[model samples]
Target: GTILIDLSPDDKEFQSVEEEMQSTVREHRDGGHAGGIFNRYNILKIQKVCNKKLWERYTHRRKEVSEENHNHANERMLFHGSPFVNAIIHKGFDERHAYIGGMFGAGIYFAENSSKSNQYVYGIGGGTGCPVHKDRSCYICHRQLLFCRVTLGKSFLQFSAMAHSPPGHHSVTGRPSVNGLALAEYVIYRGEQAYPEYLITYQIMRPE
Candidate 1:
């Protein structure tokens, strides 16, 4: 189950979240690494899966894999760009939507750099776009991103294709190499290993 609480425009935390987002996106854009510019709009704080039954489900599942090794020591707050932000906010991260032949094979991908995830926000598929605000220009497009809390337990770094995370390893850290990522990409085979903590909605400054 998923729950998202809206952070109002008047809230201090609302401003704080937007600032961090602006910093991350600006850092990437000014570095000449991005193909398009992004402008932050609002924030929705997603609730944790800590409700009675779901909490048990989350912890039980986490423990089983972690019991053998890695006690969820590599937990991190990461970013994920998506075209289906509305669905994800209500349904949580689904690996089924992941690309079949992604950098480390079919798995839910996350990144430390918000801009890296933003690339997917500018997806090439036909249905790829976010909901535009009423005040925004028609010329400016929309997109959404998720700031998530991930448990990269004993992550296995990979530079080549792999269908699954090796036994006892919780995730695959796709390191940069020739023809690969310039920034690190993380892939988790399971859906529940991560939580969508915040939803960031933004607009593409201009998309010709």
Candidate 2:
């Protein structure tokens, strides 16, 4: 087992590396790099606010396992028991950047359960199993914010969140990811004070 390495992001080299990272964020906002040519692209796209079909009842693979389809180093896109709530970058962390696309604020603590069918959409990997809440009541906390979510894309740019020079460390959740072209400012809560900033909350717009 465990021999996966299919890899993705080859849509013409991820759209020419996202158009040279938005042309180096328009040349570092007019300053033009300034010896800061490091470019990173953070990401975290989770969608499943309940209803996961009993997490496939013990996995036989019906569907729902995509980072664009299996093999991204052991594949951990499991969604079972349905009581979902994701986008957390504190525990079970992940920083797999190459041309830089890692780190960003993302807090996820979902536990406003009213039996919304027991929300199940799990994806465990990069260690620590991630799934606990007997009555801990889901939680989330973010600072500087570095998180990514892409099912395709639409529009929204302010760019900024990619600049690291001796500030890059993540030996499996040591927590420290930011290398260039950075831009992450999010807030999406659904409990206790209920937040809403609209980076995502429906409307990924796909219905041609």
Candidate 3:
């Protein structure tokens, strides 16, 4: 089983991540929305993910890919919101559990924006499997996102979905469009190429 190491809220690492998350938040979230318009968010927890086997495997793969790609490791944090966020953290991101079809084809898709990631977060059955966040007082706006480390050896920037990356490319990045995807996304076709690094559980304040 995987373990999550809780980081102090005052830690520079934690505060840095929190700052990035809050930087682009929209006030009252007007001009576009989903289930509700969120004015703010409170980060409940930030844990450093420690998956012994998974990290080893991912890094090992990354090394090999890096060597083959002239040591080009364009890695970045990908916001992956899911009800199974905990599950993926522990068991690793498995394709078998991934749903088919996405703006970037049949692969694991991730967003760069906090609110963009929030859009796909669903389901309340999270806690039971990963020791549910049994706090009754703050259940309504509870949500989570995995800050995954994705290695973009050489991304094939595309305007549409493709089942496979074009020759000489290691991954695909969706073109950015406000009406479509305001922020570009990382849609990796290979498993173990991305590592789950942090699990951020937060609360959304909205005018519903």
Candidate 4:
């Protein structure tokens, strides 16, 4: 049954309801304050059931990938996917300035692309760093032989767990302080193809 009653923030009824809710929660929580949500007996039972099902599903999936790798030992080596992705957010430094760091790194691949073959080796992500610019390129150890550039655009960026990069820069750094995001993904050159150990797709946020 539901009943309409006055429970405004300043009402005595509101205070009573709030205190009761907190009291019940503390009983289930640890240290009489902070504790796991599954601390209660019924919640613990439910957690065990969910954990069992989760384990079985992943174990079966991994077994299939392992078998394929074993059969095609020469062509397909197992590649582990990144457990998560990272996104960087920055803070404004001055009245008009903001952080504008970007990803910067390089990858070296030895596999040759073939029209008939659908397999190739590759590595992704430059590690911890920001891009210099979308088309910024600099000479490598030998400027004449090699150069590097940022892999810009949406298609090139992969999804991962979102995170914020630390914010702090001088006004004269010359780089614009703008907000940005980052993530990473990778593939490897192999002779054979098989299902990946895991396929995780998640969205950091939606556009305004």
Q: Find the number of clashing residue pairs for candidate 3.
A: 1
Over 1-208, each residue of candidate 4 has an lDDT whose tens digit, in order, gives: 1111323446564454333222222121122111112211111000001123333443454344345445322222121211111110011011111112222112211111110000110112212211232111111110000000111111122232311211221001112123122112222111111222111111111113
Off by over 4 Å in 3: 26-35, 97-99, 123-139, 160-163, 178-181
Give the Cα-based TM-score of candidate 2 against the true structure. Answer: 0.19
lDDT per residue for candidate 3 within 1-208, as digits (tens), equals: 6888998998999998787676645432334333235656788999899978999988987887798688977788888767677778878877743536666667777777776666556632222322254332233656788888988788888874225656788788887644443567777777677898988888776454
Quality of model 1 by C-alpha lDDT: 0.62
RMSD of each: 5.2, 19.9, 4.9, 24.7
lDDT of 1 by residue, 38-135 (tens): 34333334223223443454456667767656354477778887666666656665665576667577888887766667766645221233345322
CA lDDT, every model vs. true structure: 0.62, 0.21, 0.70, 0.19
Candidate 1 displacement at residue 86 in angstroms? 2.2
- Which sequence of candidate numbers ranks them by TM-score, best first? 3, 1, 2, 4
Please give the lDDT score at residue 54 for candidate 2.
Answer: 24
At residue 19, what lDDT does model 4 achieve?
38
Whole-model lDDT, candidate 2? 0.21
On lDDT, who's better, 1 or 2?
A: 1
The 10 consecutive residues of candidate 2 with the worst lDDT sum are 196-205
Listed per model in order, the count of residue pairs whose N, CA or C atoms clash below 3 Å is 0, 30, 1, 15
lDDT of 2 by residue, 22-54 (tens): 232212332311111223323222222221232
TM-score of 1: 0.70
